[PDB]
Write a protein that binds this ligand. Structure first.
Ligand SMILES: [Mg+2]
Ligand SMILES: [Mg+2]
Ligand SMILES: [Mg+2]
Ligand SMILES: [Mg+2]
Ligand SMILES: [Mg+2]
Ligand SMILES: [Mg+2]
Ligand SMILES: [Mg+2]
Ligand SMILES: [Mg+2]
Ligand SMILES: [Mg+2]
Ligand SMILES: [Mg+2]
Ligand SMILES: [Mg+2]
Ligand SMILES: [Mg+2]
Ligand SMILES: [Mg+2]
Ligand SMILES: [Mg+2]
Ligand SMILES: [Mg+2]
Ligand SMILES: [Mg+2]
Ligand SMILES: [Mg+2]
Ligand SMILES: [Mg+2]
Ligand SMILES: [Mg+2]
Ligand SMILES: [Mg+2]
Lengths: 97, 217, 87, 117, 206, 25, 62, 129, 96
RNA sequence: AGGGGAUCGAAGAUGAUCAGAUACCGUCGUAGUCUUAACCAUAAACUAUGCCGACUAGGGAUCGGGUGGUGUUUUUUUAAUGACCCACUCGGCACCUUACGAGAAAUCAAAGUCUUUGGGUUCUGGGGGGAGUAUGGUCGCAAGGCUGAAACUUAAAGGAAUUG
């Protein structure tokens, strides 16, 4: 029987959309599916701001950031515990953490 | 000796209500099995089945007995008890209690010429309990209760004389057949025919006439 | 339920809902009987004599137990300008 | 880990509910009381019990405890729950009103002090 | 039926405007719309007092007629309305139900809270649903305090207060009791107010 | 065996048969 | 299957069951006679029971 | 497309009674609707109906009164010989001692009760009980 | 509703369509393909007579075990070679 | 068939892994991947849910259109017009609660208005195998598509849910 009433993830009013490549699995999965995160960080991490904000030129400066929109896939989005097997009802909760 | 914890229980033991219909008419949630024992003695029980069932302990297995009892006079009131426990003997009697608490009324009727004392049902009725659906159909005199031995017996205690049937679904699961047969006869008083079309003005509920008489310690 | 020689058979004659006039079931344990006190000249309520409505399992279950009572209240003269037929 | 079992607590809640003002915050005396007002099979339990119902006490006299109530407190709540001030409603400068709530009274047949918004 | 005295009187009415009973929710709900008077600017709802009053009267009357005044279970799990239902219990007989309902009250004998009443009053159909739902298992009429967004299910005669808070929940309970005393019992002269305060019915904590 | 491959099988049979037969026109 | 099995032991048992002659006894009544012999028995006098009334036991309980 | 108009109407009527409602709006007022509504109203299964003039085809507001279990149509409007009228009533009426199947005979739209009296038979329309 | 045609004129379809769908009915189909006559080792006939060829020790299926006794038969009318089961104990010596 | 052939990459080749490893992983690479003209007609071509017509219950977002609002925000002075707000209301993509009702259940605003069995209408199924097989026919350059048996065989095959 049907596990998910949305089947995969949102279709409804399309029937097909272009797929992408699982950022780590190197797989392939339609854009409508596929777990997604927006990986922003600092160039020089946290511990290093000391040596960095000190041993430079420029007043204080302004730390740069990286912008990587990850596309995972149920295979490697589970393995990397990006998501996980929530209980029967728990599954319904579309609510973001 | 019987000690009524219920309000309806008191007024019955205390002779303030003496008839069964007095409870149906006012639609009163019966809780004590002693009530219907008093209001309705000369009752009869027929034990329908004893079909043991099984499962698990947190390792191996669980295994008990399942009993089916119908109770009835032969006159308009009938009930169904399904109970399963650790003993045959006790889960039987256990049901005769749950049977009685379930006693329901019948609008028995005529197939045609209303010549003295109904011989059938009001109208066509029908019950369901998953898959099985039994249908009850009025009948001429001399005919009989045309049904499967189970249903018939339930329709015997129901006190029916002549009725036709048309059961559909897995008639073989005894428990589910009987329940819907019950569900059927318990629906006769459900049908608003033009006999009952008139207007009466609503009795006041004996839970308020002898209200002073009833209430708690 | 008459018969041959007009005798009254049929072991019991069901009440009837007042918001639909549909038979009040023998096991309709969501059906109910409201009893409204009839007053006398100024204030004093009267034991014994009350105004009485009777609502059904179905009507009540679907939330229509307020509108239907009010409808029935104004009507038998228990209320004034609370429920308004036309809407 | 020291977790007093139910059989202890179920009796501490039981001695307080019965014999309250005959008890006190002390351990030693309460221990003696149990020999009179109760019956306990073992000496160690007796104390184990005594030592809990005496724990409750020291916070009973600090603020009531959830499942537990006795006589001398039950009217002490009836005392506090009878306060009634000068009044509130009252009216401190007519009846301050909003819009259409005025139209509500305007079309109701009532006098009433007024105010707009 | 009911004479000219039972008319509303802006003596009373003022307490209702003062207690802010006339202030309703921003979700009208299909069944409560008869009680709507009209809508405020900047999203509020104005309820109709003459209806709340008239209801209350009928409520008050239905409270009466009931013979033994002690099997009339008046419930609030809700904080605000809890203190009130203790007081309503004081005045008219009425076994109250403060705080937890303990599922298995009306159905299931054996329990030590087997109130088997013949009327239930409720303060808030939401937070007291288990109270309502269970009452509808065993043939029991139900008086209830509604707002505008309220569970109309298995409640008869609804009294549209505010129940959101302030003193509406007390006042309506106060007046409720006040009127079931002016109804039969011992108050008489339904024209004269009461030595009893309104703030006798409110909250606490502090 | 997998419905997909059991098809491939029955397709393989059919051609060999198509061939064994036309070994006599 | 295997279709040639051993025809050798064609009729073992019935060819080696102890002969025992069927004992003589008085002939039973025939016709209406018989069906009377049932009625007057099977429920007129009744015999041994159990709580359900049995039919053909032997050693019984005891 | 709309195909029965009558059945469309009795549907609404039926659906209305079930859901506890005691009034229906109907589209679109046909004459067959009316007589049907009449023969119903006679035996008591409905209140009074009030036709509405749109400059179109019509509307009807019927007053309901509990006591209606099922009205309903039997499409296709079958032929009925006169000795077969019993075969229907037997088939689709709850009991011998009441309920109504209504026809359409060349005499007019009547119930099977009346049709029996005039000794006419036609083509079946529907039922009431 | 109901998915079939309801009309007063669809009697054409209504009857023809069952004549179609009758063909999934096994016995109807056997009766109308005359399999009875053609395929069966009898004629269709109730009984049939033939001569004995050999005797077989047909071993029983699972989960039993024995050697069911059987003869091979040359059907007279048919020429059809068919094996039959000899029933009851040691009857297989009544036949040669 | 011609063009194009960056990429990735069936075949194949190679390096490892393994008892074996024709695989998975690594590298190399044909066809292919793009296109143009022709073919092919099939996918879990999915909502595993025919189409039109009516009816039965609430809640809120959002898309398109329209409507009403001595609304908000816009010029250098507050009118236009732009967006934005609120209410309405058609026609959408969906969601939420609910469950009167239905269902074997899972569940369903239809999968409801069905033993109180009929609005119109197309299509398909009738235990499991044998088998999408054989045979004829037909369309295709081909691969194949469409059409489609029986002999014989078998008591289960199968669904949803529950407990281990
Ligand atoms: Mg697709
Ligand atoms: Mg896709
Ligand atoms: Mg079915
Ligand atoms: Mg296999
Ligand atoms: Mg292939
Ligand atoms: Mg051979
Ligand atoms: Mg290779
Ligand atoms: Mg290995
Ligand atoms: Mg290979
Ligand atoms: Mg070509
Ligand atoms: Mg296909
Ligand atoms: Mg539609
Ligand atoms: Mg459910
Ligand atoms: Mg039904
Ligand atoms: Mg078949
Ligand atoms: Mg191929
Ligand atoms: Mg077997
Ligand atoms: Mg499958
Ligand atoms: Mg399964
Ligand atoms: Mg499991």
């Amino acid at each position: 029987p049907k596990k998910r009433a949305s089947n995969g993830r949102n279709k409804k009013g399309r029937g097909h959309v272009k797929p992408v490549r699982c950022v780590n699995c190197s797989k392939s999965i339609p854009k409508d599916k596929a777990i997604k995160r927006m990986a922003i960080r600092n160039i020089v991490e946290a511990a290093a701001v000391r040596d960095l904000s000190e041993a430079s030129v420029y007043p204080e400066y302004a730390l740069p950031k990286t912008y990587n929109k990850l596309h995972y896939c149920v295979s490697c989005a589970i393995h990397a515990r990006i998501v996980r097997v929530r209980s029967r009802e728990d599954r319904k909760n579309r609510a973001p953490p | 000796g019987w000690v009524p914890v219920t309000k309806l229980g008191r007024l019955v033991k205390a002779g303030k209500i003496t008839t069964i219909e007095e409870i149906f008419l006012h639609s009163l949630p019966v809780k004590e099995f002693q009530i219907i024992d008093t209001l309705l003695p000369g009752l009869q029980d027929e034990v329908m089945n004893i079909k043991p069932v099984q499962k698990q302990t947190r390792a191996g297995q669980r295994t008990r007995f399942k009993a089916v009892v119908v109770v009835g006079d032969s006159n308009g009131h009938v009930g169904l008890g399904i109970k399963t426990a650790k003993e045959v003997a006790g889960a039987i009697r256990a049901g005769i209690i749950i049977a009685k608490l379930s006693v329901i009324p019948i609008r028995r009727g005529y197939w045609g010429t209303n010549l003295g004392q109904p011989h059938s049902l009001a109208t066509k009725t029908t019950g369901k309990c998953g898959s099985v659906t039994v249908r009850l159909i009025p009948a001429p005199r001399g005919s009989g209760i045309v049904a499967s031995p189970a249903v018939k017996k339930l329709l015997q205690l129901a006190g029916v004389e002549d009725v036709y049937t048309q059961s559909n679904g897995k008639t073989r699961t005894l428990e589910n057949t009987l329940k819907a047969a019950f569900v059927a006869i318990g629906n006769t008083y459900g049908f608003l025919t033009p006999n009952l079309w008139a207007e009466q003005p609503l009795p006041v509920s004996p839970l308020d006439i002898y209200s002073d008489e009833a209430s708690a310690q | 339920m008459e018969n041959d020689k007009g005798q009254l058979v049929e072991l019991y004659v069901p009440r009837k809902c007042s918001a639909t006039n549909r038979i009040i079931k023998a096991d309709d344990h969501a059906s109910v009987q409201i009893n409204v006190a009839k007053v006398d000249e100024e204030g004093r309520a009267i034991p014994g004599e009350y105004v009485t409505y009777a609502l059904s399992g179905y009507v009540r279950s679907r939330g229509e137990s307020d509108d239907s009572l009010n409808r029935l209240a104004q009507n038998d003269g228990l209320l004034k300008n609370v429920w308004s037929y036309s809407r | 880990g020291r977790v007093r079992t139910k059989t202890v607590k179920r009796a501490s809640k039981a001695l307080i509910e019965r014999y309250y003002p005959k008890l006190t915050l002390d351990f030693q005396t309460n221990k003696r009381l149990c020999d009179e007002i109760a019956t306990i099979q073992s000496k160690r339990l007796r104390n184990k019990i005594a030592g809990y119902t005496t724990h409750l006490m020291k916070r009973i006299q600090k603020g009531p405890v959830r499942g537990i109530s006795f006589k001398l407190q039950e009217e002490e709540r009836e005392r506090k729950d009878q306060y009634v001030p000068e009044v509130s409603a009252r009216s401190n400068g007519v009846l301050n009103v909003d819009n259409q709530t005025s139209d509500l009274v305007k079309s109701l047949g009532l006098k009433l002090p007024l105010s707009v918004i | 039926s009911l004479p000219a005295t039972f008319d509303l009187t802006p003596e009373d009415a003022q307490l209702l405007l003062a207690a802010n009973t006339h202030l309703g929710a921003r979700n009208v709900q299909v069944h409560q719309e008869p009680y709507v008077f009209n809508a405020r600017p900047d999203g509020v709802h104005v309820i109709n007092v003459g209806k709340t009053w008239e209801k209350l009267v009928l409520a008050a009357r239905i409270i009466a007629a009931i013979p033994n005044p002690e099997d009339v279970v008046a419930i609030s799990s809700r904080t605000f309305g809890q203190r009130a239902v203790l007081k309503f219990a004081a005045h008219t007989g009425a076994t109250p139900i403060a705080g937890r309902f303990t599922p298995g009250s009306f159905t299931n004998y054996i329990t030590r809270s087997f109130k088997e009443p013949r009327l239930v009053i409720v303060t808030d159909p939401r937070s007291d649903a288990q109270a309502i739902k269970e009452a509808s298992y065993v043939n029991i009429p139900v008086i209830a305090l509604t707002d505008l967004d309220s569970p109309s299910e298995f409640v008869d005669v609804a009294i549209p207060c505010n129940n959101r808070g302030k003193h509406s929940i007390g006042l309506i309970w106060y007046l409720l009791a006040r009127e079931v005393l002016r109804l039969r019992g011992a108050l008489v002269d339904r024209t004269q107010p009461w030595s009893i305060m309104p703030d006798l019915y409110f909250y606490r904590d502090p | 065996m997998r419905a997909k491959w059991r098809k491939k099988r029955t397709r393989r049979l059919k051609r060999k048969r198509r061939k064994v037969r036309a070994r006599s026109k | 299957a295997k279709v040639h099995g051993s025809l050798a032991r064609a009729g073992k048992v019935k060819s080696q069951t102890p002969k025992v002659e069927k004992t003589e006894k008085p002939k039973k009544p025939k016709g209406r006679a018989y069906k009377r012999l049932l009625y007057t028995r099977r429920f007129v006098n009744v015999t041994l029971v159990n709580g359900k009334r049995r039919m053909n036991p032997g050693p019984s309980v005891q | 497309t709309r195909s029965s108009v009558l059945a469309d109407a009795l549907n609404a009527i039926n659906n209305a009674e079930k859901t506890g409602k005691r009034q229906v709006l109907i589209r679109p007022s046909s004459k067959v609707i009316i007589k049907f509504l009449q023969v119903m109203q006679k035996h008591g299964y409905i209140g009074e109906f009030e036709y509405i003039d749109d400059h179109r085809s019509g509307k009807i507001v019927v007053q309901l009164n509990g006591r209606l279990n099922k009205c309903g149509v039997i499409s296709p409007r079958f032929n009925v010989k006169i000795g077969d009228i019993e075969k229907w009533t037997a088939n689709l009426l709850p009991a011998r001692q009441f309920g109504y199947v209504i026809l359409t005979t060349s005499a007019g739209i009547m119930d099977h009760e009346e049709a029996r009296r005039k000794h006419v038979s036609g083509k079946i329309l529907g039922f009431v009980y | 509703g109901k998915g079939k045609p309801r009309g007063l004129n669809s009697a054409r379809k209504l009857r023809v369509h069952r004549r179609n769908n009758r063909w999934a009915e096994n016995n109807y189909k056997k009766r109308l393909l005359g399999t009875a006559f053609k395929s069966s080792p009898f004629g269709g006939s109730s009984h049939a007579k033939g001569i004995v060829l050999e005797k077989l020790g047909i071993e029983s299926k699972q989960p039993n075990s024995a050697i069911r006794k059987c003869v091979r038969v040359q059907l007279i009318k048919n020429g059809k070679k068919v094996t039959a089961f000899v029933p009851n104990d040691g009857c297989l010596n009544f036949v040669d």
